[PDB]
Amino acid sequence: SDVGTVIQVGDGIARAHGLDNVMSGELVEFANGVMGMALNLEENNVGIVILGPYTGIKEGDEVRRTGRIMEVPVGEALIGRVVNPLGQPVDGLGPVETTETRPIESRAPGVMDRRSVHEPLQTGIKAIDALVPIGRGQRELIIGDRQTGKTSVAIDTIINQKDQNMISIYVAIGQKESTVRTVVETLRKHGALDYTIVVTASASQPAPLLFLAPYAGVAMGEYFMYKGKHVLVVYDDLSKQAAAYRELSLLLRRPPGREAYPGDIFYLHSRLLERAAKLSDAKGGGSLTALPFVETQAGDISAYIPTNVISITDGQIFLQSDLFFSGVRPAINAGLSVSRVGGAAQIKAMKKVAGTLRLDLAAYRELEAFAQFGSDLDKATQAKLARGARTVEVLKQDLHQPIPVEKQVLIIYALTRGFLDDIPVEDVRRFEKEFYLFLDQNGQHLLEHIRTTKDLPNEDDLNKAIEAFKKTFVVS
Amino acid sequence: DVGTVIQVGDGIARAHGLDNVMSGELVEFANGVMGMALNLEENNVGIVILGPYTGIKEGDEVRRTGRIMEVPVGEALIGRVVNPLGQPVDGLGPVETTETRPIESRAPGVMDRRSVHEPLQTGIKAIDALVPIGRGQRELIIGDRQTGKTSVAIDTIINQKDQNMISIYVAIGQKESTVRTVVETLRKHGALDYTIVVTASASQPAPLLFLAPYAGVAMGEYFMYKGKHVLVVYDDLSKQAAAYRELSLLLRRPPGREAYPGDIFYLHSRLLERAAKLSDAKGGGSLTALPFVETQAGDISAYIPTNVISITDGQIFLQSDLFFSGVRPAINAGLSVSRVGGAAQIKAMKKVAGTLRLDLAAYRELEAFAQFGSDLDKATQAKLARGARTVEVLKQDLHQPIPVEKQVLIIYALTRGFLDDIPVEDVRRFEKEFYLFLDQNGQHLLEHIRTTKDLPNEDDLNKAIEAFKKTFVVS
Amino acid sequence: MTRGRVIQVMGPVVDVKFENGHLPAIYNALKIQHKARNENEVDIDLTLEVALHLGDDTVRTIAMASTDGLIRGMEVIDTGAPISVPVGEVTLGRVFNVLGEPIDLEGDIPADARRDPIHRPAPKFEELATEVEILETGIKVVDLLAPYIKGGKIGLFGGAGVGKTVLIQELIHNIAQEHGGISVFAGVGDRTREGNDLYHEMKDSGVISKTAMVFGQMNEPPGARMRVALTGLTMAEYFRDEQGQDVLLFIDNIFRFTQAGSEVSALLGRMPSAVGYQPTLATEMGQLQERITSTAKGSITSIQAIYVPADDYTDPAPATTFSHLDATTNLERKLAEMGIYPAVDPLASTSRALAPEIVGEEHYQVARKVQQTLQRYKELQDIIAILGMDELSDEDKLVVHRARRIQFFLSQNFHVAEQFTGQPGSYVPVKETVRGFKEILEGKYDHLPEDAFRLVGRIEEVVEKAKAMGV
Amino acid sequence: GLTMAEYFRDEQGQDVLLFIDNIFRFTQAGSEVSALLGRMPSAVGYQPTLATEMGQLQERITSTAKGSITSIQAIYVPADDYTDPAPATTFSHLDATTNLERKLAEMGIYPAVDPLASTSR
Amino acid sequence: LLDAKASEHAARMTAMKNATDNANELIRTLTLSYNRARQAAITQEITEIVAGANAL
């Protein structure tokens, strides 16, 4: 029958006898009162990963079968709270009235149901919005070494979504719980926390809660997409999820593979990452863009988790530690970062200026890689080296200060059309500062045409605006 | 209480029976070779076999000694050459020790020990000046093949004479010719009078390689608990680690870094922290231990070098590059450090020998930068001239131990710069003729240093330098 | 029947067979009292910690002291609770073994003392606090590039022989005199020599009255080494909760907790991972590290050291623990061999406290501009090895020029160094540090010889050295 | 896809192209299936039977007497090093190979194919 | 001036030749260390395969 006896309790795992009618991924409840996710249905004993604290359980205890399958609470009530993957509040502020529940595991949308990705996801980060564009429905990896800028870029994304509709989410896996608190207070201080949900599994939590955290986060995101509102999901580190799977599988005595990761890993991540979509007008016009992050060890590449995820995602951003400590922030290598969707997502004004900027920076990347060591070169190369140095200095940016797209296109246009030759490389971060103030003191009609039209203003008036500012600005 | 062997697995064996055995008990077969019971599974005992194992056959009979790894120790043992089971191999005769110590001893606790109060004088200029030793310190000597490690070990043991400084030399995985050549070098110098020698050689199976350091310290513990000083040399610990790897993989234990199990840190740590400097309440004894480790192509960044370097209270790194460039011997200043410095030295040495090692390290990095480009005069003058003069001062020839008084005088003349006007090959002629001059003209200073243990009064120390200007040659 | 029998021994691990219905919970503790009944045997008192069940009433257990002597069919008792530490006011000035018995010769703890479990769940998200401010500590580099955090985790990472314990002893010499709070010092994977040297250092300065101490040592079996970290932490936890004082915790080497797990895990019976480590690396290390938290009730600052298993940081045990630490110091061997002490990696030192809000603009600009010059110097070192110094020009000439001087001026004479070397030590205020590195970056003192900048406190001391060398 | 193209050649007797979008994923799917079946890895973790499975696929693409099944396939080369087993095992079977390099694609000249590195029989 | 320009082209030829020699030597040392590092990684991987194969 459907009540069984436990016969191991080691290490955060159990084994049990009986439970004839059990199912893979079912919930089963212990006499202590916490419940477990059945995950190997072997020949005579059921493997039972345990959620919550496991110290109380002893052999000879009984497990009852809940009959339910894994489900997440969903509603409009969650927006503005910090919540546990099983669905409980952990923030104070009391219980949340979640009207209904969705399954954790379910089929994604078919090939016909989707549409092409044609509307942007403006982030406010000049080097991304210009050179590695994101469109709503796109899935894009950010991969870099530790302390390079994964969470700062995530938070700049969630902060910029105040101006355009986005029911954003943020999932923290394995994190130090005081860092999560510093993040949440940063989202509160920048006035941004009331339209977003934060899901927390801290490092202390038992292994399955780290493992199930992104599956429940996306289960929360897709309800809003079915209603028809745009959504954004961020997973703060997928690699820690993969490690929780490894440790869980090794304790279950499953045949291992490369490193020791179980062979299922690529399927497990594809089950997570292919729910992201852009549904058709017949299905409501929604979106679910996703931004997973992977931490690479020492600039490692061709390893098992990074190559899996790099094969799944429709683009990748690679961050370089040696760039960061050289003053480029957020540090982004244009040479190794690609977006297959790119070009289509951008606004038409951006498409004209950002397409040429890619050509300029690629040409100088190669010329500088070899010819910078020699002191003096050919004139035409000294010019292209000057344009590349100004390009990287003009793409440096501050922390938690998103720039609206209207004033991005006007600075990139000023850069590509070569208005910045007179100004020195050190003074540029001040040329930007004094120019954006001037652009709110004068030129409001330019920005208004760009805001709704998505279109570059008449070139006579744009040049008149930049030439007047270059009258005002004082060179060191 | 009788059991029978049921496998014979190339030095490992297993037995069925032995119902009341306890881990670590010695069992001795009908053959008469000793066996050490490690594990006790539910049905059988795992018996590592010590000695010739080829004469063992399945269905042989196992009987119990009743005792836990007891190695014989007594005053009768001094002078002889024995194996780690404590049986003589020199053919002089039997050994009549009355009682046995355990191989397994709990180390002295935090309250039992004391700071290292007194030096152990090697007589080797570069050790005594740069990287001093004191009684109860443990210090790693590490280097590649043919770099002089045994020459330093035998120099140190031969220099100990007038003291009641009992000493031990343990050969682990070593060629019988080399062990026999020194048991005759120690006899030649008469130093074999007070020392004991323990030998396990490469033909012997790995069980007798890995135990040999434990017998070396078990012999040392009798003397140290009684109250006398001791010194142990293990002739190589890297062969002990290799013997443990070979045994561990003959058992079914899963490998780690470079196939070494994680147990390699616990093995060496269980070996080295029995070395101590006991306090008056315990009896004031001591047990300094000098282990050796062999690097492969100077890879001090490998697993076993860093494993042992975490446990020991210093390291001496002996360099091939200098040695085969004619600097017999050379110590790499920047890699070699002592953590018990100052406390161990005599006070005069603290006044003379303090900062010299960091002066060498700065000279090494300036030499590197000096390759690429031009230099500043006050840096070239100060740090390259003094750095070269320091290495040329500290080089020393075979079997010539120098008393500390004469080292103190040359280290003073180096750090205060009294020899900086004399260059190159004239410096090693200078310091030879300096010792040959002061031997009969330094009696007041030498007895002053011997008794007062302090730097002599600078006006008469300068009297030595003044007279040596007159005595020394033009060149 | 609550008495058991040992059925198998396998080194550190032992397997007990309790009768049915009395299996102890995980993390409980068990006692061995055995009369040496016959002339062959050895008497022992040993205690065992339960670590797994294994069916048919068997439980697998880690011994807390060496298993030499145990026999099949010998009895085991059950305490009923975790390894129980006696805590309260009387702990201060005492030294304990891992089990909670004193070893200091002074006496034994009154039996009336409340004694507490070592295993309990970590503090929750509502309880934490994040008000972040500088634990100003006078170590010139740490006061510049990676400012330590009051109430925050601090980490020291280095290989064997680079200089972690000398740094901890300078930190105790600077902080523990003025902190005004209970200090707990726990030795995990600790040399017995350093334990004695510390106990005499604390008595000679009188500091021992406020602090309490727990020790395990390199010569201990692995179970003791693991459970010393938890016994030390339970003391610091009581003082910050019940008394409400700020507390300072030191753990001597926390890597040996994970390594001891690596030893005893394969015998427990669970497959290797990425380089021989147990499967449950990150969950159990995170379980310990998530307890060490500054709740609203009262702050802990905790300073830890971690031995990188080789000079390789990509190893699992360093990799899992780099996340948990607010401010991290990386000690690298290559700098130490140049003679620069403490050997701190300027480029790889990371701390949350660096942020214009927390340090202020004057201090921030300088931390980043100094890291920028040293990173450019790494790039120039390669090309000068091919072409030489004579081929560099302008901005590349002055980076090598200033990066030498900065690399030396981050070296300081510690007040604890006076035993390794004849020198007197220093304490440097933050303002003198930020002015000093600013002055070097401006180039006001560029004429002084690069020899002078080594092992020095302030720019005035460098001018005095350079004057004696003939400037 | 093979079994469909084979009907059109055998009955209709006319040239029937077979396109495969990327076979790198196919090799990796085989490696994961072998690990699930409990076999032992090799090289950079690819299964033991790498050449066998890929040959079994590739050899049906032919020109027997009825007609043809000429095929054009694409391959992802993980990190610009071509000695990885899946490219290296593929390279022997292919009659003509053209190498695509990202530097030309970013230069904006398309389809990005390197003139110097492209070879055919 | 003729001897100056000729001797300049000689001086650059010899300086560039020596600089090429320094570049070649460095490349050799780096290749030896890269081969040692890769072979060490592959032998560790093989050791994990053996440890898995006996453990299961």
Ligand SMILES: Nc1ncnc2c1ncn2[C@@H]1O[C@H](COP(=O)(O)OP(=O)(O)OP(=O)(O)O)[C@@H](O)[C@H]1O
């Ligand atoms: N745009 C930026 N300009 C300057 N500094 C930045 C920028 N973005 C991030 N930083 C700096 O990055 C450091 C911390 O990086 P961050 O908080 O993003 O952690 P991370 O690099 O994502 O690593 P982890 O994922 O472990 O948090 C701080 O010094 C912060 O000031």
Ligand SMILES: Nc1ncnc2c1ncn2[C@@H]1O[C@H](COP(=O)(O)OP(=O)(O)OP(=O)(O)O)[C@@H](O)[C@H]1O
């Ligand atoms: N200071 C010295 N002066 C002159 N000769 C020396 C000196 N040191 C060593 N030698 C000579 O070089 C030989 C090599 O040194 P040694 O025999 O100690 O080798 P080793 O490094 O100990 O190798 P092993 O451990 O295999 O013996 C010595 O036997 C001796 O013949």
Ligand SMILES: Nc1ncnc2c1ncn2[C@@H]1O[C@H](COP(=O)(O)OP(=O)(O)OP(=O)(O)O)[C@@H](O)[C@H]1O
């Ligand atoms: N600030 C300093 N000034 C001078 N010498 C120093 C300084 N810091 C460290 N050293 C020297 O470097 C070594 C540091 O010894 P230390 O006890 O710190 O080793 P460790 O790194 O702690 O070893 P382990 O990791 O095993 O604990 C000693 O030789 C010491 O004299």
Ligand SMILES: [Mg+2]
């Ligand atoms: Mg993060």
Ligand SMILES: [Mg+2]
């Ligand atoms: Mg020798």
Ligand SMILES: [Mg+2]
């Ligand atoms: Mg230490």
